[PDB]
Amino acid sequence: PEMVRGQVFDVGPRYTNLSYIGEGAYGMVCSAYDNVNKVRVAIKKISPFEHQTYCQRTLREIKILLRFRHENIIGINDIIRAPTIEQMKDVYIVQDLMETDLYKLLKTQHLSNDHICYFLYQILRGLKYIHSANVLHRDLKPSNLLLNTTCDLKICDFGLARVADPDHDHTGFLTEYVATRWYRAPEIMLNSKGYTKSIDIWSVGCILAEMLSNRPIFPGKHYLDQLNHILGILGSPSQEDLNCIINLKARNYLLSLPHKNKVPWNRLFPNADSKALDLLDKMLTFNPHKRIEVEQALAHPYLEQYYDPSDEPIAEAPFKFDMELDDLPKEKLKELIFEETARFQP
Numbered sequence: 001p002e003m004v005r006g007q008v009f010d011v012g013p014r015y016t017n018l019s020y021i022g023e024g025a026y027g028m029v030c031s032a033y034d035n036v037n038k039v040r041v042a043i044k045k046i047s048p049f050e051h052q053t054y055c056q057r058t059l060r061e062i063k064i065l066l067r068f069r070h071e072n073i074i075g076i077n078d079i080i081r082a083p084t085i086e087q088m089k090d091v092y093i094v095q096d097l098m099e100t101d102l103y104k105l106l107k108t109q110h111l112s113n114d115h116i117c118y119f120l121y122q123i124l125r126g127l128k129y130i131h132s133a134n135v136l137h138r139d140l141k142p143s144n145l146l147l148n149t150t151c152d153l154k155i156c157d158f159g160l161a162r163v164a165d166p167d168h169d170h171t172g173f174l175t176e177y178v179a180t181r182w183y184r185a186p187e188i189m190l191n192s193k194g195y196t197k198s199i200d201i202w203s204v205g206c207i208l209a210e211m212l213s214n215r216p217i218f219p220g221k222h223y224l225d226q227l228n229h230i231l232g233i234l235g236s237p238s239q240e241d242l243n244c245i246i247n248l249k250a251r252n253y254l255l256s257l258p259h260k261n262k263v264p265w266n267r268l269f270p271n272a273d274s275k276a277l278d279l280l281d282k283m284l285t286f287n288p289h290k291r292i293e294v295e296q297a298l299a300h301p302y303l304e305q306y307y308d309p310s311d312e313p314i315a316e317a318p319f320k321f322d323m324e325l326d327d328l329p330k331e332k333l334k335e336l337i338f339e340e341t342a343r344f345q346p
């Protein structure tokens with residue numbers, strides 16, 4: 001077997017000539033020549049079986065990505081693993097090879113308004129499909145948006161995804177949360193478990209803002225600082241939006257703050273298209289009930305050049321996990337990962 005930077009990368013015979021791309025939360029990722037389809041592919045090595053939350057995240061990614069089929073969602077082309085549970089220590093996920101991701105692109109490249117528009121359209125087109133399956137991505141951010149050399153965009157990393165559950169979204173103030181801080185909606189810190197579709201729209205708003213300036217709009221340094229940043233731009237919530245937060249700890253925290261006025265988007269983003277800023281405003285609405293939904297966003301004038309609901313497909317059915325994954329021991333989750341990956345064995 002080939003090794004890559006002091007690590008077995010055990011994918012042959014089918015996949016050879018491994019060129020390391022980089023490490024991450026996604027383990028070691030390499031490109032490799034696929035000797036059957038005669039193209040280079042991406043392959044990511046996952047070693048989750050010791051840690052139960054690693055197993056949960058791995059199983060979610062696999063189950064979701066295998067069920068979904070959409071141009072703006074990364075597919076799984078193949079999964080390589082040992083023929084038996086006893087011998088399975090790693091899983092390799094094979095996907096279409098992408099040139100970059102939006103995190104890397106924003107570090108290095110100014111985006112034209114046409115590119116921002118097209119990227120935003122593709123993110124929302126993919127999100128329409130995900131939400132139509134009653135799934136929440138819950139960790140949308142630049143590093144989870146992959147792009148090929150022709151700027152086709154694909155959403156990746158469904159490791160924190162959940163089925164939507166609005167009736168059980170309410171929680172107390174300062175409840176701990178897992179998804180990436182800079183892209184978290186204000187309500188996460190106040191009264192929300194992130195079980196509604198509005199959570200993803202906030203992240204997309206943050207991504208739009210970041211495309212406009214190449215800098216994160218709300219770069220918080222810790223849990224409550226994130227809310228400081230959001231209120232620093234949106235200004236103090238209205239009485240009506242405050243009255244929607246029934247929880248007294250969360251309500252009174254907001255009431256304790258000095259009055260802050262809204263920073264106009266056109267002063268933060270003087271070069272931005274005015275239609276882009278009108279849509280941005282609607283995605284970065286404080287009150288999640290008044291926040292724009294994905295299908296409304298697609299229909300917004302900013303996206304008129306691309307909008308075509310007949311070519312923005314939805315999922316054939318709602319998604320459901322077989323059972324809750326949070327209570328399952330890792331030995332059941334290893335067996336589930338083994339079963340979910342069986343279709344790729346010869």
Ligand SMILES: *CCC(=O)NCc1ccc2cnn(C)c2c1
Nearest residue numbers: 026042095096097098144156157
């Ligand atoms: C969702 C984020 C992720 O999986 N990133 C890893 C990755 C890096 C490079 C690359 C090229 N083609 N694909 C697919 C990837 C994935």
